[PDB]
Structure 1
Amino acid sequence: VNKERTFLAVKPDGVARGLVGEIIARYEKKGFVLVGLKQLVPTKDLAESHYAEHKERPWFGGLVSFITSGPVVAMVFEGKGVVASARLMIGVTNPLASAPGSIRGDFGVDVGRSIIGGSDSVESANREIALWFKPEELLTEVKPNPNLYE
């Protein structure tokens, strides 16, 4: 319940613009615990696996090349309904459609430069996390903060 985890990723455009700390802080303020964190250069295979559900899309190729174009900071956050909440905090697909207050809403304008990526469902999160992180890279005994959880 409270141990639900979602996978986030500061895209290459997000890293190049120096938005890593801003994004992280927003999740920390919200009360979600960071249980996995690292910066790396996505490999083509990682890019296509993460977005495999889009393989047949015409822009899939452009996406893969972009994701693997520069460093990316991968994160895993745990907390009550973190998956859908993280999505709300991100915005929607189109940055211009994303509301002020949301990451893409405040920083993005192009769907191709969406700043941050994140799991859209618990099912997808468990798959993405297992894809990007090895078991020994994630915290284990995470104790609920009495100020955040009842």
Structure 2
Amino acid sequence: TERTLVLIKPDGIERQLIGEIISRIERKGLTIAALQLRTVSAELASQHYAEHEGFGSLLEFITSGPVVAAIVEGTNAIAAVRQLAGGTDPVQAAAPGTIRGDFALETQFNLVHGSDSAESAQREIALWFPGA
């Protein structure tokens, strides 16, 4: 079954939105296959954002506090999670009714991430949940 990696970033945790974000995923019909609150090392951090090198503040913010990582599974999971999350700019791009559209104001603090493609999902799941 199709799987994607979801991260609730440190701002999502600080705003007490862990449950809200997971609920939205569940009500969409997707399942949580793996789930863990964790701290992010600079090492893990630079690997996650490797496709950004040419980027430096994403390493810093993702390490500023705990995140929640999840494997999300179900039909069309990758695109479904992107749809739920919304566009990168929470006010200019993200649609009302999305996580970013309902809950966020700025790109730098946009709460969540979902893998952007089958290839990204594969890489990110291997990085965050190696052995899954």
| In structure 1, distance between residues paired with 2:130 and 2:122 | 12
Question: In the alignment, which of 47, 50, 53 is matched to residue 48 of structure 2?
Answer: 50
1:124 aligns with 2:120: yes
Partner AA of 1:71 in structure 2? P
| In structure 2, distance between residues paired with 1:68 and 1:81 | 30
What root-mean-square deviation, in Å, do the aligned CA atoms of Structure 1 and Structure 2 show?
Answer: 0.8
1:106 aligns with 2:102: yes
The Cα of 1:122 is off from its aligned counterpart by 0.7
Question: In the alignment, which of 75, 81, 87 is matched to residue 82 of structure 2?
Answer: 87
The Cα of 1:47 is off from its aligned counterpart by 1.2
Q: Which runs of 5+ in 1 are unaligned?
A: 139-150
Q: TM-score, normalised by structure 2?
A: 0.96
Matching residue of 1:143: none
Matching residue of 1:19: 17
Q: TM-score, normalised by structure 1?
A: 0.85
The Cα of 1:134 is off from its aligned counterpart by 2.8
| In structure 2, distance between residues paired with 1:132 and 1:32 | 19
- State the structure with more CA Rg: 1
**Corresponding pairs, count:** 131
Percentage identity across aligned positions? 51
| In structure 2, distance between residues paired with 1:47 and 1:90 | 21
Q: How does 1:26-65 map to 2 (within 5 A)?
A: 26-56=24-54, 60-65=55-60
Q: Which runs of 5+ in 2 are unaligned?
A: none
Deviations 1:46-97 (A, max 9, x none): 11111111011xxx11111000110000011111110011001100111112
Runs of at least 4 residues off by over 4 Å = none
